[PDB]
Amino acid sequence: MSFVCGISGELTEDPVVSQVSGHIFDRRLIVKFIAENGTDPISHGELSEDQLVSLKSSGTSIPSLLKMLQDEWDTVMLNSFSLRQQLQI
Amino acid sequence: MSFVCGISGELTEDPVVSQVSGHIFDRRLIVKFIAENGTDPISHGELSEDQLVSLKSVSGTSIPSLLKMLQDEWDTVMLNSFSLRQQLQI
Amino acid sequence: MSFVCGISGELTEDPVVSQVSGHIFDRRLIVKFIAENGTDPISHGELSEDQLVSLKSGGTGSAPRNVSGTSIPSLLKMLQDEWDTVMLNSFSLRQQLQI
Amino acid sequence: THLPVPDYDAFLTKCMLKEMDRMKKKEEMGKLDMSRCELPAPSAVKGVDRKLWAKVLRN
Amino acid sequence: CTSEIILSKDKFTRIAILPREEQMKALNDEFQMYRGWMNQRAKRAAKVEKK
């Protein structure tokens, strides 16, 4: 099924939920969040990697997929800039 | 958000997760299951009332999905090239 | 520790060994091979996904960046040029096998 | 007869087949356009297109 | 507002109220500012890269 990561807001291939808040994450981001910040990202309570519960569970052209990456990367960086610009405003 | 209840396939309004399976259930079903059988219908685990952790929670194909697409294509190119090396060395 | 996959020849972050061969593999590759052929890729012994022993020791360290690999578009450019050489290699093999 | 016949297309996807057939027919690979780093300004005859201006700033 | 508000004639204004040619000049200068910020970074990057 479709699952949305709380950190990225993207559809995730590996949805995991934390017992300290009940928000779903991509495993890889929340582990890196825990490994950097220690807290739950939403409830700010103490969290640890063992408190994470795993949820249940085509290709077209490589020149096309590389161009989908290029355009998608520019969108991610555009967002990051607008956040820094909006935060100063 | 909204979720599908793993007991029955209906929409979920009080979502909780089965810790032994990751399946999402509606509280109104799994609680009586815990009362009457203590298990879950697919994984057949052992589960208890305290394990019902509740859930409380873009347009493009996200970068990790596209990198997995490239990694999947790479895996086929490698598995092909291995077979061709295997034939060529013989 | 450091390991290389017998199938791909690359470093692997998930080294695994079959019980029916001495050779070591990247798990997702050998599983995909088994999913087609049901056999060890090198010894041709019959093989199943549960006959795989996993090295929990730490996988190979990351390859250092090139200075051209310090920017995302130049990584994508580098990935494109890398990919073309990989496909030309795969195409060269099927020609060499015919010869 | 003592050796198998090779399946040169083992494991390949429907995508990778067409990519093999491109280089098999000897056509060049596609390349990414990299002019986005230089980003030319628009001219006076394209500045009427508001989207075409935003697409420059967003770049 | 963060897209609607741009400076023109040395003052902050709505974008839609300006004459069209003044909108083009404003958007040109807005773009040229970003191109300045890029070039200020690219020179710093090339300096470290060359080392």
Side-chain angles (χ1 to χ4, degrees):
Chain A
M1 310 87 80
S2 179
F3 285 104
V4 177
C5 172
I7 291 169
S8 62
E10 302 276 39
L11 284 72
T12 186
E13 303 302 323
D14 190 12
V16 177
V17 63
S18 65
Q19 79 98 11
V20 183
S21 72
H23 287 269
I24 309 174
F25 309 113
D26 181 338
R27 189 188 309 275
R28 192 179 63 273
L29 294 180
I30 184 61
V31 167
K32 283 182 175 178
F33 193 99
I34 287 163
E36 185 57 21
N37 298 317
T39 75
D40 182 285
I42 307 301
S43 71
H44 317 286
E46 183 77 344
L47 180 61
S48 58
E49 180 177 349
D50 56 337
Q51 305 190 47
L52 281 287
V53 177
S54 304
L55 305 192
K56 71 175 299 293
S57 57
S58 183
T60 54
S61 160
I62 279 58
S64 185
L65 286 173
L66 291 165
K67 195 164 181 72
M68 293 190 184
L69 281 178
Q70 189 193 39
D71 284 339
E72 192 64 30
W73 261 122
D74 289 351
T75 305
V76 168
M77 294 307 200
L78 167 67
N79 293 324
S80 181
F81 185 82
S82 73
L83 290 173
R84 297 195 299 99
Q85 194 173 34
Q86 286 169 359
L87 178 58
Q88 75 156 11
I89 289 167
Chain B
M1 301 183 186
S2 62
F3 307 96
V4 62
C5 180
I7 306 300
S8 58
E10 74 201 297
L11 277 295
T12 310
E13 297 300 332
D14 189 13
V16 288
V17 62
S18 163
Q19 298 194 133
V20 300
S21 74
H23 288 51
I24 303 308
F25 304 137
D26 196 285
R27 189 117 60 182
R28 298 300 299 170
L29 289 92
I30 187 62
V31 167
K32 61 167 61 77
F33 272 59
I34 293 162
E36 74 121 56
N37 63 58
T39 191
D40 40 29
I42 295 176
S43 38
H44 310 150
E46 180 182 334
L47 191 140
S48 56
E49 292 278 16
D50 58 330
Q51 300 193 56
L52 298 185
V53 172
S54 301
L55 309 182
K56 301 192 183 180
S57 59
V58 301
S59 302
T61 40
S62 188
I63 297 293
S65 75
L66 295 178
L67 300 173
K68 279 285 172 72
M69 286 178 182
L70 289 180
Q71 193 177 45
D72 279 334
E73 297 276 42
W74 150 269
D75 289 348
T76 67
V77 174
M78 288 298 101
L79 291 160
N80 192 30
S81 303
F82 176 86
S83 305
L84 295 172
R85 278 189 287 260
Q86 185 67 281
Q87 300 287 9
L88 176 63
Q89 285 181 325
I90 289 170
Chain C
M1 292 180 179
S2 299
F3 308 100
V4 295
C5 174
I7 291 162
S8 60
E10 304 305 331
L11 77 177
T12 166
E13 304 86 352
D14 192 15
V16 76
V17 198
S18 76
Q19 288 166 5
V20 309
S21 185
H23 298 80
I24 79 183
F25 307 104
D26 197 14
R27 191 192 309 270
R28 73 178 192 292
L29 289 179
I30 182 62
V31 168
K32 285 175 182 181
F33 193 95
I34 290 162
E36 294 300 326
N37 299 327
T39 187
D40 185 280
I42 294 171
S43 75
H44 307 275
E46 209 83 329
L47 183 62
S48 298
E49 302 96 314
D50 57 344
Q51 295 169 330
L52 278 288
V53 58
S54 179
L55 276 70
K56 81 180 188 74
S57 186
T60 312
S62 183
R65 292 186 187 243
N66 301 309
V67 182
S68 54
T70 54
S71 186
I72 279 72
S74 68
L75 283 172
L76 298 178
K77 188 175 172 67
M78 186 179 302
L79 177 63
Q80 182 161 66
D81 289 340
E82 181 68 29
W83 202 290
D84 294 343
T85 62
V86 165
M87 296 204 71
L88 291 172
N89 269 268
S90 193
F91 184 75
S92 79
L93 288 170
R94 58 195 293 155
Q95 292 198 341
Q96 287 178 2
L97 178 58
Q98 288 171 15
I99 293 162
Chain D
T1 54
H2 66 299
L3 298 183
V5 63
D7 47 345
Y8 306 100
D9 310 323
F11 296 88
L12 296 195
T13 64
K14 187 258 188 180
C15 166
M16 204 60 58
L17 260 294
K18 266 171 177 148
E19 201 61 50
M20 289 275 162
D21 274 25
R22 156 149 56 212
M23 52 192 177
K24 190 264 179 180
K25 189 184 318 166
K26 196 58 171 68
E27 278 53 50
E28 188 50 83
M29 306 295 96
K31 293 296 194 185
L32 291 175
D33 47 313
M34 290 281 161
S35 59
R36 298 187 177 180
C37 301
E38 277 66 51
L39 189 51
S43 82
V45 301
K46 309 293 190 39
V48 298
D49 185 341
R50 300 274 57 67
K51 169 214 76 167
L52 196 42
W53 255 111
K55 199 205 309 193
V56 172
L57 274 67
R58 290 196 304 109
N59 196 344
Chain E
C1 292
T2 64
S3 63
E4 185 72 357
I5 301 306
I6 296 184
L7 75 86
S8 69
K9 319 304 293 187
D10 202 25
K11 198 171 184 177
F12 284 103
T13 67
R14 301 281 294 265
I15 185 59
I17 70 176
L18 306 177
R20 187 184 64 81
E21 64 271 29
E22 300 287 16
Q23 298 185 30
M24 301 313 93
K25 257 291 294 175
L27 293 173
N28 175 84
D29 295 4
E30 178 71 8
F31 168 61
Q32 285 287 1
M33 181 178 68
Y34 293 112
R35 204 175 194 258
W37 298 346
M38 286 173 58
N39 290 337
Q40 286 176 7
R41 284 188 161 96
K43 290 175 181 181
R44 289 172 173 83
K47 186 183 178 184
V48 182
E49 169 160 7
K50 188 176 182 178
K51 192 181 71 178

